[PDB]
C-alpha cells in the first residue's frame, strides 16, 4: 500500500494497481504515463483528444463511460468493470462518498489552478508507481516561460464559451485559472462565482471583449459566434479574435500548452523572437514520450 491524500482526506491504495476507470478528468494521464493497459473504462470525451488517440493503440477494449459530471451512468456497470481504483472528478461531493461505499478505492479531485492539476498527476503517479517528477518539472518550466514572456504586459481583456455561447467561467474554475496564464483579463470573474455559469447577452455586449476563446467540446465553432447577430459590435467580432481552443483535455499534463496557445493567441508581439515548434516538440518528447515522427503532428 500507499497512503495518498485526495478531495476527501487520506485514502490508502493497495499495490499494485490492476484496472483503472477514468472518469471526468485526467483523461491524458495514461498516456504521459504509458498505462493504458492497466483502464479499463473512461469518460467518452477522451475518445477526442488528439493524444490519447495517438497513444491508445486499442481504443475499443476500454469501455466508454459517461462524461457528465456526476451521477449519470454509475454504480452496476462500475461493479461489472472490476476495477481496483476509479479516478473521478467530485461533480457532486455526496454523488461521489455514496459510491465509494461499494469495495473500491476512489481517488477523487476537484482541480481548479494548474498547480492543483500538477499535484494531483503526482497523487496518481504514487498509486501508479511511477517517477512523475521530471514530467512534472517540464509542465512547470512551460509555466515559468510563459510568465517571464508576459512580465510587464497588459492582460488583455477576454472570456471563454462553453455548451453555449453565453455560458461562461469565474471563480474557481481550472479554464479561468488556465485564460490568467495565458494573459487574458477574463470578464468570467466577474459574473460567476463559482466554475462555469450562463449570464445574459447585454453583460458580454457591455464588457465588450477584446479577445474570445471556445472550450474544446464545445458545439460552437469560430464562425457560429462570428456570425451571431447578437454579437456583431462587440470588438472581438470585428477583428476576428475568435479562436476555438485545440483538443487538450484541461485536466491534465498539457494544461501549460493550452495557456501557451492562449497567450500566443493574445500576445503575439510577446512571444516574436521564440521557437514556438521547438518549445511544442520538447514538451510532448518530454511528457510524452514521442520520437520525432510522432511529435510532428502535434506541432503548431
Ligand atoms: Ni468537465
Ligand atoms: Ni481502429
Ligand atoms: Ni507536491
Given at each position: 500500500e500507499v497512503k495518498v491524500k485526495d478531495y476527501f482526506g487520506e485514502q490508502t491504495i493497495k499495490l499494485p494497481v490492476s484496472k483503472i476507470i477514468y472518469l471526468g478528468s485526467f483523461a491524458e494521464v495514461?498516456?504521459?504515463?504509458?498505462?493504458?493497459?492497466?483502464?479499463?473504462?473512461?469518460?467518452?470525451?477522451?475518445?477526442?483528444?488528439?493524444?490519447?488517440?495517438?497513444?491508445?493503440?486499442?481504443?475499443?477494449?476500454?469501455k466508454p463511460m459517461s462524461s457528465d459530471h456526476?451521477?449519470?451512468?454509475?454504480?452496476?456497470?462500475?461493479?461489472?468493470?472490476?476495477?481496483?481504483?476509479v479516478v473521478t472528478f467530485v461533480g457532486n461531493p455526496?454523488?461521489?462518498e455514496h459510491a465509494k461505499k461499494f469495495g473500491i478505492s476512489f481517488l477523487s479531485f476537484q482541480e481548479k489552478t494548474i498547480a492543483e492539476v500538477m499535484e494531483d498527476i503526482d497523487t496518481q503517479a504514487k498509486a501508479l508507481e511511477v517517477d512523475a517528477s521530471k514530467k512534472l518539472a517540464k509542465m512547470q518550466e512551460t509555466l515559468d516561460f510563459i510568465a517571464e514572456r508576459l512580465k510587464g504586459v497588459k492582460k488583455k481583456?477576454?472570456?471563454?464559451?462553453?455548451?453555449?455561447?453565453?455560458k461562461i467561467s469565474g471563480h474557481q474554475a481550472l479554464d479561468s485559472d488556465i485564460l490568467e496564464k495565458g494573459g487574458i483579463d477574463n470578464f468570467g470573474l466577474k459574473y460567476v462565482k463559482f466554475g462555469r455559469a450562463d449570464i445574459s447577452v447585454e453583460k458580454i455586449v457591455k464588457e465588450?471583449?477584446?479577445?474570445?476563446?471556445?472550450?474544446?467540446?464545445?458545439?460552437?465553432?469560430?464562425?457560429?459566434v462570428l456570425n451571431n447577430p447578437k454579437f456583431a459590435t462587440i470588438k472581438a467580432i470585428k477583428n476576428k479574435?475568435?479562436?476555438?481552443?485545440?483538443?487538450?483535455?484541461?485536466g491534465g499534463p498539457r494544461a501549460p500548452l493550452i495557456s501557451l496557445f492562449i497567450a500566443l493567441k493574445a500576445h503575439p508581439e510577446a512571444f516574436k523572437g521564440v521557437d514556438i515548434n521547438a518549445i511544442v516538440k520538447d514538451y510532448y518528447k518530454v511528457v510524452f514520450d514521442l520520437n520525432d515522427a510522432e511529435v510532428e503532428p502535434f506541432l503548431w
Open positions: 495514461p498516456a504521459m504515463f504509458h498505462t493504458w493497459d492497466r483502464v479499463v473504462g473512461i469518460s467518452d470525451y477522451a475518445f477526442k483528444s488528439d493524444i490519447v488517440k495517438a497513444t491508445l493503440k486499442d481504443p475499443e477494449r476500454i456526476a451521477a449519470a451512468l454509475n454504480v452496476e456497470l462500475l461493479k461489472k468493470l472490476s476495477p481496483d481504483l455526496k454523488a461521489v481583456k477576454g472570456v471563454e464559451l462553453f455548451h453555449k455561447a453565453n465588450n471583449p477584446e479577445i474570445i476563446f471556445i472550450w474544446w467540446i464545445s458545439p460552437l465553432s469560430p464562425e457560429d479574435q475568435v479562436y476555438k481552443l485545440p483538443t487538450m483535455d484541461i
